[PDB]
A = this chain, B = another copy of it.
């Protein structure tokens, strides 16, 4: 669960820049 949480987290800044 935590590995996945972190993988997802790492990508969030792309979406944020929209």
Contacts and interface: CB of A to CB of B under 8 A. Distances in A.
Interface in A1-18: 6, 9-13, 15-17
Name the prevailing secondary structure of the A interface residues. helix
Contacts of A17: 6, 9-10
Contact of A9 (B6, B9, B11, B13): B13
A6 B13 CA distance: 10
Contacts of A15: 13
Contacts of A16: 9-13
A17 B6 CA distance: 6
14 contacts: A6-B17, A9-B13, A9-B16, A9-B17, A10-B13, A10-B16, A10-B17, A11-B13, A11-B16, A12-B13, A12-B16, A13-B13, A13-B15, A13-B16
